[PDB]
């Protein structure tokens, strides 16, 4: 019996059986690395959705970009509420950017120990908040 034959039989056995899947996301220990892997996907997705919405509306919707901005000025939000929208854009970008660099450092082979993860994790987290406040204020 071969390794390929064993798997093919494993799946034949279990799928046709009344065996239950042991709980996973329901019971496994929450960690910062975990949350940060999740957030990288989330921010990654949100950003592409925003980029594609910007490209698609540029093809599908009428009027130039100024005509679209002049429409935002219409329901003139308070200077702080405009800063909120501005912070809500930069936040996911900055998180994904900094955590992105971390991902890249990893691919070089560097910084892959449990202490280095928790450390570099907080450095990313802190760097997000600072650069997000710092950019929104420009």
């Amino acid at each position: 019996t071969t390794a390929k034959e064993e798997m093919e039989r494993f799946w034949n056995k279990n799928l046709g059986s009344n065996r239950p899947l042991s709980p996973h996301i329901t019971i496994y220990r929450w960690s910062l690395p975990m949350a940060m892997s999740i957030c990288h996907r989330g921010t990654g997705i949100a950003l592409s959705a925003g980029v594609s919405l910007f490209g698609l509306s540029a093809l599908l919707l009428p009027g130039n970009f100024e005509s679209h901005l002049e429409l935002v000025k219409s329901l003139c939000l308070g200077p702080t509420l405009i800063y909120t929208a501005k912070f809500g854009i930069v936040f996911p970008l900055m998180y994904h950017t900094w955590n992105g660099i971390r991902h890249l450092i990893w691919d070089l082979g560097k910084g892959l120990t449990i202490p280095q993860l928790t450390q570099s994790g907080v450095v990313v987290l802190i760097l997000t908040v600072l650069s997000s406040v710092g950019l929104a204020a420009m």
Binding site: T2, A3, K4, E6, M7, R9, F10, W11, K13, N14, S17, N18, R19, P20, L21, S22, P23, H24, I25, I27, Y28, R29, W30, S31, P33, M34, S37, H103, W106, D107, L108, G109, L112, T113, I114, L117
Partner: protein
């Protein structure tokens, strides 16, 4: 008397239409060894022998008793019970695995994946074997430390979200580290073709560096690191 509560996952396939549930046991810790396995053994021997789990060495070097204790995957024989009586130890089988009965997961696929990478020495001219000890320098041998110690407990792969969603086509941290183990054994001659065996989007390239595997390893090993080390060889090996 110091009474500690254990909440344990239960399922009996030989019982008509039984569904998975939790059962709680209570143990006097003065009359019980320090490790979780000791409890399991005690509640098995004294309270309930319908409890069914894998175990052998009680030494943390066989890898049989691997399970999910209080969130993380470890070995029950190496994990001491948290003497804090206000907390209740929750014991589950290895996450996202087909449960045979109680805490006994079907590891058939796990081992088959291990087989598919050929965890043995491969020489281009094996017509001289069994007569001369091969020369490996002390420095060439250090390169295998943190790699050979693996016990195949399947804790890491079972703590791995990619191995949950894609356990069929993706080999997982456990098996992958052993592929690496043989890649850098200086005595091996099949290094290029060992890397070519991973040239598809699933076998190796399904890890997105969650590092949750390394954090969980009961033996202190770092499968995560070794995977990223594989990836680098994959991008760089010529011909």
């Amino acid at each position: 008397p110091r009474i500690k509560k254990f909440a344990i996952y239960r399922w009996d396939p030989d019982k008509t239409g039984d569904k998975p549930h939790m059962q709680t046991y209570e143990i006097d810790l003065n009359n019980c060894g320090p490790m979780v396995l000791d409890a399991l053994i005690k509640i098995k021997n004294e309270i309930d022998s319908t409890l069914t789990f894998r175990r052998s060495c009680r030494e943390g070097i066989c890898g049989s008793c691997a399970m999910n204790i209080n969130g993380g995957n470890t070995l029950a024989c190496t994990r001491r019970i948290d003497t804090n009586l206000d907390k209740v130890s929750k014991i589950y089988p290895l996450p996202h695995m087909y449960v045979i009965k109680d805490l006994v997961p079907d590891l058939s696929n796990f081992y088959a994946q291990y087989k598919s990478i050929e965890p043995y020495l491969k020489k281009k001219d094996e017509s001289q074997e069994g007569k001369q000890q091969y020369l490996q320098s002390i420095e060439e041998r250090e390169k295998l430390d943190g790699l050979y110690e693996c016990i195949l407990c399947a804790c890491c792969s079972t703590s791995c979200p990619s191995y949950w969603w894609n356990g069929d086509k993706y080999l997982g941290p456990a098996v992958l580290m052993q592929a690496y183990r043989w890649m850098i054994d200086s005595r091996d001659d099949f290094t290029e073709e060992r890397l070519a065996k991973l040239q598809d989007p699933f076998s190796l390239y399904r890890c997105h560096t969650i590092m949750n595997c390394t954090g969980t390893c009961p033996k202190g090993l770092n499968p995560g690191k070794a995977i990223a080390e594989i990836k680098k060889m994959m991008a760089t090996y010529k011909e």
